[PDB]
Every structure is written in structure tokens, then in C-alpha cells.
Symmetry: C3
Subunit: 143 residues, 3 copies
């Protein structure tokens, strides 16, 4: 796992559209952005049928209804080298305040922004541009 | 974490009943199989009382009700060395399509198939034999 | 990640108020304890407004209502070094028995007990002092 300093060298290269203060002791705190966010409104029948999304204008605050999953576009764009992978964990503040999210991975070689799924246990809200996820960088044994 | 190459040499030895296609850039995608799957219908009173399960025939597609947790047996059987461990994360497609799952680990020394717990946020379904989880291989500092 | 023996050497200094039996093959099993636990009753409006908590006496068992998130104080107190971090995952028994928890991390330098959030999918209960989470220790590339 990469330390605060090692992650700092990734800014502008591996992690684009970053925020310096978001580089933590041992990870980077991903933020949610975008002109819009999405609310899943009808279940998926995988793998053939994806869930039905309701598009919502992401103004200053995203309003979430209890028992619904929402998709957010990350502020950050990623350019993963075949040498690194990232474990996406949830920021503790979100976990302790009633938000759910499963663990997922940004695989080596991945390019682009990432869309994260946050499920609201209660009617609640998340501020646009706030940090929601704690990224842990893992190095592959072989590229 | 083991790369695609390292995981490939695990097939037939550490990962049985596998699919060569499921070996990813830095992980193996576990699949759900079995003649049956289970639905939790009554809550647990841990550790003394486990949750009450309803057994359901796993035909070709497993139907899930919103706000219920389901147990699926993996197609893959594991034979973990005292030198390796596995972090079970959720496949992104499942996360983004309204399925929840907590992070868990297959510890060194573990033998057998794994029963994974997927919680449905919406009435939905998952195809029998489809990939649902993204396995990351962790090597112990000492066997 | 750190192995069983490596975790034993952390008892008394990195992991306080521990239980020897809770040291596993490749992790430490955190326990829930404390005079009381908390039920989230009203959603959060992050980051400005945290979720509204209801304080509940934690006697011998913690009774949880379906679709509610609860905060538990860990028995264990941590004193993380500058080159060690912990990935908090859920014990498989809790996952398979209908309890949800998102992945979170105890960062290098962190000092104190941790409050974990468990979301109940069903009306259920958890015994005071029982193991709920499986801690995986990660070493930083640089302190």
C-alpha cells in the first residue's frame, strides 16, 4: 500500500483533477462531482438488463431517499499504470452516518473517471464536491 | 496483490472449478452456482442463533426481493495455502446495479467452496453462473 | 498483510484491550463492547449535519431493527504506528447472517477505539463482546 508521499507523486499523472488536501496518510479521498447524478429506480436483471436510472441535476446537494442506490461521477480522472490497482473503501464519516457502499477495485490499466454507487439507509444528502471514498493503492507483484 | 499472470498458475491448484476467462488483470472473478440458493427470511440473534433461511431452486436465474439477503455457493472451490489470503470485493457491475455485499476474506488454509451473501436493494435477478465477486489475492508476510 | 504470529506481537502495544483467541490466521477479530451503542434515527446532511443518534444501553445484547444503522464502540483500543494501516472487513458469520458493513480503514497514526457501523437487514441482535469484524493489517511502503 502506498503512503502519503508516494500518492503525492501520482497527482497530475495517475490521479487527475485532484485536490492536494485529499492526499491522506495512506490513501486518496475521492470526491463526487458532475452536472448530474443518478438514482436507480428499477432493479437490474444481470447480466442482460442493467438497472433503470433516473437522471438528476447535481446542483449543490444531492438528495437521497432511504433504500435507494445512487450513482455519482468522481471528480477525479484516473490513469492507472499496469503496475497499480486501487481498493475503493468508504470514508468513515459516511459509514458512521448511515451510508452503504460495497468494496470495489479500480484495476491496473484503467483509464477515466469512476462512477461510484452509494446506497442511502436514510433520507439524507451529500454535498457536491465532498470526499466520499478512501482510496487505497495496491501495487501488483508483476506489471 | 497477485497479477493476472500469477493467478493463472493458481488454476487447477488453488482455484478449482474455474473459468480461464475469469482471471482478470489483478484478480479472479468468482461465480455463483449450485442447484440451490438461500433467502434469509428471519433475522439472526448472534452468535447463538443463525438467520432463518428459505431454500430455493437455482434454475437459470435467481430472483431477489428488495431488502433481503441471499446466500449463493460459488462455482469455484478453493484450496488456500498457508501463504495466501483473499479479499472478496464486489464486481463493479453489481455495485452500480443495486446489489450490496460487505467485504470478507478467505483466509490462508481455507478449503472448499464459499457461500457469499448478496443483499438486493431492489427486486432484481442474477443469472446462474455469472460472475458476481472480484477476488484480490493477498500474500502473507509469513506462512 | 500481517500473519497470525505478527499480530500476536502487536498485542499490548498496537492493539490494547485484546483477546488472544481473536488473533486469526491473518487478521484480528474486533469485538463490540461499551456501556451503550447507538441507533441512527435521522439521516445525515453531510458534511455539515451528522446523522441523529439514539443512545441505547448496551447490556448483554444489542437489539437491531431492520433497515437501521447502528454504531458500536470497539473493545479494542488502537495505537497505530506510522507504517501500519488496517483494512476493516466484516466477519463472514455476520455477512452470511444478514448484516451489512462497508469497508473502512484505520489509518497510520490513529489512536483510540473505533466506532463501527453495522446495518441490520433484519430485526436481529448481536451479543455484547462478540467478534464482528475481521481486521487485516497493511504495511505502508514508507512510514
Amino acid at each position: 500500500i502506498l503512503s502519503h508521499q508516494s500518492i503525492k507523486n501520482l497527482l497530475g499523472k495517475v490521479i487527475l483533477n485532484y485536490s492536494e488536501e485529499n492526499v491522506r496518510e495512506n490513501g486518496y479521498d475521492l470526491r463526487i462531482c458532475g452536472d448530474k447524478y443518478y438514482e436507480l429506480v428499477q432493479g437490474a436483471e444481470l447480466p442482460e438488463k442493467k438497472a433503470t436510472l433516473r437522471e438528476i441535476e447535481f446542483k449543490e446537494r444531492a438528495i437521497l431517499s432511504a433504500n435507494h442506490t445512487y450513482l455519482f461521477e468522481s471528480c477525479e480522472e484516473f490513469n492507472m499504470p499496469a503496475d497499480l490497482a486501487v481498493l475503493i473503501t468508504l470514508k468513515s464519516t459516511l459509514a458512521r452516518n448511515g451510508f452503504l457502499a460495497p468494496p470495489t477495485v479500480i484495476d491496473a490499466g484503467y483509464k477515466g473517471k469512476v462512477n461510484v454507487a452509494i446506497t442511502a439507509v436514510y433520507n439524507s444528502s451529500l454535498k457536491k464536491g465532498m470526499a466520499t471514498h478512501h482510496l487505497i493503492f495496491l501495487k501488483l507483484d508483476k506489471p
